[PDB]
Design an enzyme around this catalytic site. Structure first.
Site, PDB file in Angstrom:
ATOM      1  CE1 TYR B  15      -3.441   2.844   0.956  1.00  0.00           C
ATOM      2  CE2 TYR B  15      -1.719   3.491   2.514  1.00  0.00           C
ATOM      3  CZ  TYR B  15      -2.883   3.775   1.826  1.00  0.00           C
ATOM      4  OH  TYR B  15      -3.496   4.989   1.978  1.00  0.00           O
ATOM      5  CG  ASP B  39      -6.276  10.331   5.947  1.00  0.00           C
ATOM      6  OD1 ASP B  39      -5.888  11.292   6.624  1.00  0.00           O
ATOM      7  OD2 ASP B  39      -5.532   9.764   5.131  1.00  0.00           O
ATOM      8  CG  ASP B  99       6.422  12.266  11.416  1.00  0.00           C
ATOM      9  OD1 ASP B  99       7.098  11.783  10.486  1.00  0.00           O
ATOM     10  OD2 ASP B  99       6.834  13.169  12.165  1.00  0.00           O
ATOM     11  CG  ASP B 102      -2.514   4.853   7.236  1.00  0.00           C
ATOM     12  OD1 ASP B 102      -2.677   5.970   7.752  1.00  0.00           O
ATOM     13  OD2 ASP B 102      -2.527   4.684   6.000  1.00  0.00           O
TER      14      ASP B 102
HETATM   15  C1  LIG Z   1      -3.736  10.114   0.386  1.00  0.00           C
HETATM   16  C2  LIG Z   1      -2.511  10.084   1.308  1.00  0.00           C
HETATM   17  C3  LIG Z   1      -2.480   8.737   2.078  1.00  0.00           C
HETATM   18  C4  LIG Z   1      -3.742   8.379   2.873  1.00  0.00           C
HETATM   19  C5  LIG Z   1      -3.293   7.720   4.160  1.00  0.00           C
HETATM   20  O1  LIG Z   1      -2.720   6.541   3.943  1.00  0.00           O
HETATM   21  O2  LIG Z   1      -3.417   8.187   5.237  1.00  0.00           O
HETATM   22  C6  LIG Z   1      -2.501  11.283   2.311  1.00  0.00           C
HETATM   23  C7  LIG Z   1      -1.270  11.236   3.235  1.00  0.00           C
HETATM   24  C8  LIG Z   1      -1.085  12.669   3.756  1.00  0.00           C
HETATM   25  C9  LIG Z   1      -2.225  13.468   3.126  1.00  0.00           C
HETATM   26  C10 LIG Z   1      -2.107  15.002   2.997  1.00  0.00           C
HETATM   27  C11 LIG Z   1      -1.843  15.666   4.366  1.00  0.00           C
HETATM   28  C12 LIG Z   1      -1.771  17.201   4.264  1.00  0.00           C
HETATM   29  C13 LIG Z   1      -3.036  17.796   3.589  1.00  0.00           C
HETATM   30  C14 LIG Z   1      -4.250  17.687   4.542  1.00  0.00           C
HETATM   31  C15 LIG Z   1      -5.527  18.251   3.904  1.00  0.00           C
HETATM   32  O3  LIG Z   1      -6.585  18.117   4.844  1.00  0.00           O
HETATM   33  C16 LIG Z   1      -5.801  17.563   2.536  1.00  0.00           C
HETATM   34  C17 LIG Z   1      -4.585  17.763   1.609  1.00  0.00           C
HETATM   35  C18 LIG Z   1      -3.301  17.134   2.197  1.00  0.00           C
HETATM   36  C19 LIG Z   1      -2.158  17.448   1.206  1.00  0.00           C
HETATM   37  C20 LIG Z   1      -3.412  15.560   2.360  1.00  0.00           C
HETATM   38  C21 LIG Z   1      -3.672  14.833   0.992  1.00  0.00           C
HETATM   39  C22 LIG Z   1      -3.771  13.272   1.117  1.00  0.00           C
HETATM   40  O4  LIG Z   1      -4.885  12.893   1.915  1.00  0.00           O
HETATM   41  C23 LIG Z   1      -2.480  12.753   1.783  1.00  0.00           C
HETATM   42  C24 LIG Z   1      -1.286  12.963   0.816  1.00  0.00           C
END
Ligand SMILES: C[C@H](CCC(=O)O)[C@H]1CC[C@H]2[C@@H]3CC[C@@H]4C[C@H](O)CC[C@]4(C)[C@H]3C[C@H](O)[C@]12C
Ligand SMILES: C[C@H](CCC(=O)O)[C@H]1CC[C@H]2[C@@H]3CC[C@@H]4C[C@H](O)CC[C@]4(C)[C@H]3C[C@H](O)[C@]12C
EC number: 5.3.3.1
Lengths: 128, 129
Positions: B15, B39, B99, B102
């Site tokens: 994953y 998430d 950081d 999951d």
């Molecule tokens: C889609 C992956 C992986 C999902 C997971 O395994 O947790 C996740 C991991 C970190 C996530 C980001 C964290 C920062 C931001 C939070 C915002 O509220 C939505 C946009 C962003 C940029 C998110 C986008 C996306 O949701 C990401 C890149």
């Protein structure tokens, strides 16, 4: 007072510190009176401070156990958190190590309402 | 459910690999039809392939997401696991890092039935990391 993300980080780091020193009574006090613990996750839960105290006394009472955070505590805004750590123990004089991730949910009193520990023999080492 | 502890470790590691390369179709394929994603944990859960695909399409692919396991996948015997990892991305050209941990539950078919991601701003760095 449902712990804020910052408070969850402090509470969970304190828990690891208590396991590390082996202060059983202090650990039991961090739990709500009717808290549940699933350790390891998959096994039937233990319920209430009496069972939780027995659990910790069994696991920590014998040989010396050391525990340390191996990464930062991940905290949510709803009083929950997750943290990665390593436990070092002894089995009949032989050093062992285990990698674990605990997920905890706190109540509005800053007490652990539920705890779930993720690990299996794939994360264990009985010769190190 | 069905996947063994060793299999959970592999699935969860795969994953992260798919997230790192940004293959959205491949990630969505890992999910069950009735799966739910939370998430960050604490937010309302999304459900169904379309919503889950939208979630990943929205979060990934452009300026450049990279993810790496930062520790061993912790697996149980009931088809569940937990893993620590770091995500590096960009915000308006500026490097950021997060950081995350999951927690995933797989069904009796090896697919992700539920995914929950633990993290908040305390785990965030919008200044390069
Ligand atoms: C889609 C992956 C992986 C999902 C997971 O395994 O947790 C996740 C991991 C970190 C996530 C980001 C964290 C920062 C931001 C939070 C915002 O509220 C939505 C946009 C962003 C940029 C998110 C986008 C996306 O949701 C990401 C890149
Ligand atoms: C009590 C602590 C902390 C609980 C947690 O936070 O996960 C845990 C962490 C690792 C745990 C040990 C793992 C190996 C063993 C598993 C056995 O089936 C029960 C005895 C042992 C020796 C366990 C005893 C105790 O349960 C420990 C030392």
């Amino acid at each position: 007072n449902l712990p804020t993300a910052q408070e969850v980080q402090g509470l969970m780091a304190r828990y690891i510190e208590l396991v590390d020193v082996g202060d059983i009574e202090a650990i039991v006090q961090m739990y709500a009176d009717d808290a549940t613990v699933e350790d390891p996750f998959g096994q039937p839960p233990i319920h209430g401070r009496e069972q939780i105290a027995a659990f910790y006394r069994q696991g920590l009472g014998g040989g010396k156990v050391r525990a340390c955070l191996t990464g930062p505590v991940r905290a949510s805004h709803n009083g929950c958190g997750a943290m990665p750590f390593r436990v070092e123990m002894v089995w009949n004089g032989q050093p062992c190590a285990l990698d674990v991730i605990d997920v905890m949910r706190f109540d509005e009193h800053g007490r652990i309402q539920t705890m779930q520990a993720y690990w299996s023999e794939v994360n264990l080492s009985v010769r190190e």
